[PDB]
Design a protein around this motif. Structure first.
Motif, PDB file in Angstrom:
ATOM      1  N   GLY B  29       0.758  -1.315   0.053  1.00 56.97           N
ATOM      2  CA  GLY B  29       0.056  -0.049  -0.076  1.00 56.97           C
ATOM      3  C   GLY B  29       0.755   1.007   0.018  1.00 56.97           C
ATOM      4  O   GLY B  29       2.092   1.075   0.210  1.00 56.97           O
ATOM      5  N   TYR B  37      -3.443   3.543  -0.004  1.00 58.17           N
ATOM      6  CA  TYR B  37      -3.980   3.175  -1.078  1.00 58.17           C
ATOM      7  C   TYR B  37      -3.388   1.984  -1.289  1.00 58.17           C
ATOM      8  O   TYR B  37      -2.356   1.743  -1.338  1.00 58.17           O
ATOM      9  CB  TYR B  37      -3.660   4.344  -2.347  1.00 58.17           C
ATOM     10  CG  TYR B  37      -4.029   5.740  -1.803  1.00 58.17           C
ATOM     11  CD1 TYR B  37      -3.504   6.580  -1.057  1.00 58.17           C
ATOM     12  CD2 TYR B  37      -5.470   6.143  -2.427  1.00 58.17           C
ATOM     13  CE1 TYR B  37      -3.983   7.895  -0.516  1.00 58.17           C
ATOM     14  CE2 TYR B  37      -5.739   7.536  -2.127  1.00 58.17           C
ATOM     15  CZ  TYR B  37      -5.117   8.271  -1.208  1.00 58.17           C
ATOM     16  OH  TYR B  37      -5.404   9.496  -1.024  1.00 58.17           O
ATOM     17  N   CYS B  38      -4.388   0.860  -1.621  1.00 62.88           N
ATOM     18  CA  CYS B  38      -4.104  -0.231  -2.235  1.00 62.88           C
ATOM     19  C   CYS B  38      -5.041  -0.970  -3.069  1.00 62.88           C
ATOM     20  O   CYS B  38      -6.190  -0.461  -3.170  1.00 62.88           O
ATOM     21  CB  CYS B  38      -3.682  -1.317  -0.944  1.00 62.88           C
ATOM     22  SG  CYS B  38      -5.062  -1.869  -0.168  1.00 62.88           S
ATOM     23  N   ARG B  40      -7.793  -3.132  -4.349  1.00 68.88           N
ATOM     24  CA  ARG B  40      -9.064  -3.676  -3.774  1.00 68.88           C
ATOM     25  C   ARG B  40      -9.085  -5.103  -3.610  1.00 68.88           C
ATOM     26  O   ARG B  40      -9.721  -5.779  -2.496  1.00 68.88           O
ATOM     27  CB  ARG B  40     -10.413  -3.224  -4.426  1.00 68.88           C
ATOM     28  CG  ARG B  40     -10.590  -3.713  -5.824  1.00 68.88           C
ATOM     29  CD  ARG B  40     -12.097  -3.241  -6.292  1.00 68.88           C
ATOM     30  NE  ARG B  40     -12.266  -3.763  -7.836  1.00 68.88           N
ATOM     31  CZ  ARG B  40     -13.281  -3.522  -8.368  1.00 68.88           C
ATOM     32  NH1 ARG B  40     -14.058  -2.894  -7.622  1.00 68.88           N
ATOM     33  NH2 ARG B  40     -13.399  -3.956  -9.518  1.00 68.88           N
ATOM     34  N   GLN B  83     -12.533   3.175  -4.190  1.00 70.72           N
ATOM     35  CA  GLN B  83     -12.687   3.817  -5.558  1.00 70.72           C
ATOM     36  C   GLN B  83     -12.366   3.465  -6.630  1.00 70.72           C
ATOM     37  O   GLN B  83     -11.052   3.076  -6.864  1.00 70.72           O
ATOM     38  CB  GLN B  83     -11.798   5.110  -5.228  1.00 70.72           C
ATOM     39  CG  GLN B  83     -12.198   6.236  -6.404  1.00 70.72           C
ATOM     40  CD  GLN B  83     -11.028   7.547  -6.045  1.00 70.72           C
ATOM     41  OE1 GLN B  83     -10.582   7.578  -5.175  1.00 70.72           O
ATOM     42  NE2 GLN B  83     -11.174   8.421  -7.079  1.00 70.72           N
ATOM     43  N   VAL B  86      -9.403   0.506  -6.178  1.00 68.63           N
ATOM     44  CA  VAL B  86      -8.611   0.767  -5.473  1.00 68.63           C
ATOM     45  C   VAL B  86      -9.383   1.116  -3.983  1.00 68.63           C
ATOM     46  O   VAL B  86     -10.664   1.386  -4.049  1.00 68.63           O
ATOM     47  CB  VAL B  86      -7.816   2.369  -5.720  1.00 68.63           C
ATOM     48  CG1 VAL B  86      -7.390   2.967  -4.813  1.00 68.63           C
ATOM     49  CG2 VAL B  86      -6.550   1.722  -6.424  1.00 68.63           C
ATOM     50  N   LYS B  88      -9.371   2.746  -0.253  1.00 71.07           N
ATOM     51  CA  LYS B  88      -8.554   3.742   0.589  1.00 71.07           C
ATOM     52  C   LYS B  88      -8.792   3.518   2.160  1.00 71.07           C
ATOM     53  O   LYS B  88      -9.994   3.095   2.571  1.00 71.07           O
ATOM     54  CB  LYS B  88      -9.063   5.054   0.134  1.00 71.07           C
ATOM     55  CG  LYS B  88      -8.837   5.574  -1.335  1.00 71.07           C
ATOM     56  CD  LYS B  88      -9.072   6.836  -1.792  1.00 71.07           C
ATOM     57  CE  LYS B  88     -10.547   6.935  -1.875  1.00 71.07           C
ATOM     58  NZ  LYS B  88     -10.817   8.482  -2.306  1.00 71.07           N
ATOM     59  N   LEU B 177      -4.104   6.142  -9.848  1.00 70.13           N
ATOM     60  CA  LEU B 177      -4.233   6.204  -8.399  1.00 70.13           C
ATOM     61  C   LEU B 177      -5.691   6.517  -7.860  1.00 70.13           C
ATOM     62  O   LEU B 177      -6.000   6.273  -6.749  1.00 70.13           O
ATOM     63  CB  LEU B 177      -3.321   7.092  -7.765  1.00 70.13           C
ATOM     64  CG  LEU B 177      -1.994   6.306  -7.282  1.00 70.13           C
ATOM     65  CD1 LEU B 177      -2.254   5.434  -6.262  1.00 70.13           C
ATOM     66  CD2 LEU B 177      -1.124   5.682  -8.482  1.00 70.13           C
ATOM     67  N   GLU B 178      -6.708   6.694  -8.859  1.00 72.16           N
ATOM     68  CA  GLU B 178      -8.054   6.572  -8.684  1.00 72.16           C
ATOM     69  C   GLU B 178      -8.716   5.323  -8.940  1.00 72.16           C
ATOM     70  O   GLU B 178      -9.934   5.446  -9.187  1.00 72.16           O
ATOM     71  CB  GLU B 178      -8.662   7.620  -9.524  1.00 72.16           C
ATOM     72  CG  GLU B 178      -8.214   8.837  -9.268  1.00 72.16           C
ATOM     73  CD  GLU B 178      -8.819  10.268  -9.846  1.00 72.16           C
ATOM     74  OE1 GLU B 178      -9.219  10.579 -11.097  1.00 72.16           O
ATOM     75  OE2 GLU B 178      -9.103  11.293  -9.224  1.00 72.16           O
ATOM     76  N   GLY B 179      -7.697   4.212  -9.309  1.00 75.93           N
ATOM     77  CA  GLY B 179      -8.247   2.896  -9.362  1.00 75.93           C
ATOM     78  C   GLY B 179      -9.044   2.570 -10.816  1.00 75.93           C
ATOM     79  O   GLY B 179      -9.651   1.588 -10.956  1.00 75.93           O
TER      80      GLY B 179
END
Ligand code: T2L
Ligand code: T2L
Lengths: 306, 306
Positions: B29, B37-38, B40, B83, B86, B88, B177-179
């Protein structure tokens, strides 16, 4: 899967880089505890470089003549001495980001990461090999001097290289951290050229094992060979002799893939005699010799640090 | 002189890596300020991966089910949301090593460094391109998920990639990084393959300029061509069209070397039609397309960060 030219994470070394200025010469220094290490030619002018007398230039300097900066902060120098081609500046502040470290001298064929720096700040990081002829195939500009090369073992940074100069054919030469050059080079602007290079045979074999691990197996033939026969062939294509120690060092990879080292040697022999016939191995059209057996294992098994 | 595949210094990103565990799944993460953030799919079991319902798996979890570790220290999770692909995790401690950062989505042809990590610790760093077919040619093993790719501008880390999966032919796919995935991939173990790739023409041209800068000039011919004629030839060798924006972006290099972009295009056309005839360019037997114009300038002019 996948195989890349991977560098060590550079953070621990980034925390040690500083800028050293003496007159109008600025270059990079390495701040460990309360000592700054940099190339001695920081004390040279333009007119000094054909044939400098470093000992003479140094006696003329005092502590305060050395401007050391870590970012915004100036470090007060309180002592200075020369060790071979390196200058050691004792400062009044210990670097709080000093990692556990050692100074080592590597052997030809060994790899390391270079943290290329200008004005004490990092430009980038890349992996390199100490060539058989004691050069490295780097990427260095004016101001890169004092950039360092290193390996990491768990938490310990082994510093093995400090950058000094560029030689004909755009290859590079430098010292260990006690200031002794790799190879017969000297730190003066005079005519010097590296001897003929050779291919680091054990590394080519390690990379062939990496290819098999990644499923690239077309070059494997059904033969074996003796070490002696292999080494006669290698010699003609300007490959280093493979020693019994090299064979032993390749043992993990051999054991993992199920392919005896001397069988891989039969496969490499065919490659050298017949060429690759327009095929690639791991995306490459040439045999690569800048991965060590250990580099292959660490990449393919996911070894981490810090 | 010299030209290498150079990665950005990794320190600022090393300070952000953590390990996230949910049940028996552990992955990496990225801890920025008070958020982790990692991917899902940290919430998936072995049995969940053919066709997971992430929203269903997530509602079944609470904050305390997420074990976040930064080195020796466990971070207490106090909130969680999803998200796109991703997760959070809000934590009660802000990361004191958070650098200035942004989240960006890159375009095909753009390069970035990857900090490959296992168990929240760094293995190494390497430079990569987002391919035209939205894969990257990485080196990733089981446990690499949550590894990130980034660029640096002075002090600002732009995160552009988070790693999720490996596709056929051992290439890699992931998200911003918004998945949101690059390309049409989904985060489930199902049959998916990248479309045919193509060569990033503008990057090949940038690398040819790098070669001239380094004094490797044998492939320069005495001709020019029009953009239209060039693009008809490129198309047949599976090269991307060169646009006027690409021409404009190559302007610095053109101006520095004195070689008009359309003349370099005439030289590349000859290379594509005739081959390299057993010669290398910058030590390479194949044309390289994973250096951008900006990568060439930064390397050849010594641009630094931090
Ligand atoms: C290094 O960064 C710096 N050296 C000086 C300096 F001496 C005075 C002021 C500032 C700096 S910075 C630099 C790195 C080189 C430059 C180009 N690529 C590099 O890797 N080192 C040198 O300039 C170096 C120092 C004098 C001459 N040097 C050379 O590298 C020359 N090479 C040789 O003469 C040869 F190796 F013998 F071939 C050069 C400039 C490439 C012709 C000295 C060796 C002290
Ligand atoms: C990643 O590191 C991790 N994924 C999991 C996980 F799902 C559960 C527990 C622990 C981990 S770690 C991993 C990185 C991969 C592994 C090999 N090389 C890598 O880059 N990602 C996956 O394993 C990934 C996750 C399930 C299946 N995955 C795949 O990468 C598979 N690919 C595909 O199915 C395909 F892309 F569609 F082709 C695999 C395993 C390579 C066949 C999911 C996508 C959620």
């Amino acid at each position: 899967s996948g195989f890349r030219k991977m560098a060590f994470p550079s953070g621990k070394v980034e925390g040690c880089m500083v800028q050293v200025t003496c007159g109008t010469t600025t270059l990079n220094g390495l701040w460990l505890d309360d000592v700054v290490y940099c190339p001695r030619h920081v004390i040279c002018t333009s007119e000094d470089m054909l044939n400098p007398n470093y000992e003479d230039l140094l006696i003329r300097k005092s502590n305060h003549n050395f401007l050391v900066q870590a970012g915004n902060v100036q470090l007060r120098v309180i002592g200075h001495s020369m060790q071979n081609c390196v200058l050691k500046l004792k400062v009044d502040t210990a670097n709080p980001k000093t990692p556990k470290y050692k100074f080592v001298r590597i052997q030809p064929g060994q790899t390391f990461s270079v943290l290329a720096c200008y004005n004490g700040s990092p430009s980038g990081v890349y992996q390199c090999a100490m060539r058989p002829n004691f050069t490295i195939k780097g990427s260095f500009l004016n101001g890169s001097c004092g950039s360092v090369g290193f390996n990491i073992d768990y938490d310990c940074v082994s510093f093995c290289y400090m950058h000094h100069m560029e030689l004909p054919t755009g290859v590079h030469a430098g010292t260990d951290l006690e200031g002794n050059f790799y190879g017969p080079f000297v730190d003066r602007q005079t005519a010097q050229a590296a001897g003929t290079d050779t291919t680091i045979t054990v590394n080519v074999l390690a990379w062939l094992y990496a290819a098999v691990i990644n499923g690239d197996r077309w070059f494997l033939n059904r033969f074996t060979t003796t070490l002696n026969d292999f080494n006669l062939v290698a010699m003609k294509y300007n490959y280093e002799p493979l020693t019994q120690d090299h064979v032993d060092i390749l043992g993990p990879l051999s054991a993992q893939t199920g392919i005896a080292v001397l069988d891989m040697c039969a496969s490499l022999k065919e490659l050298l005699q017949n060429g690759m016939n327009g095929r690639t191995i791991l995306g490459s059209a040439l045999l690569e010799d800048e991965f060590t057996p250990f580099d292959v294992v660490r990449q393919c098994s996911g070894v981490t640090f810090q």
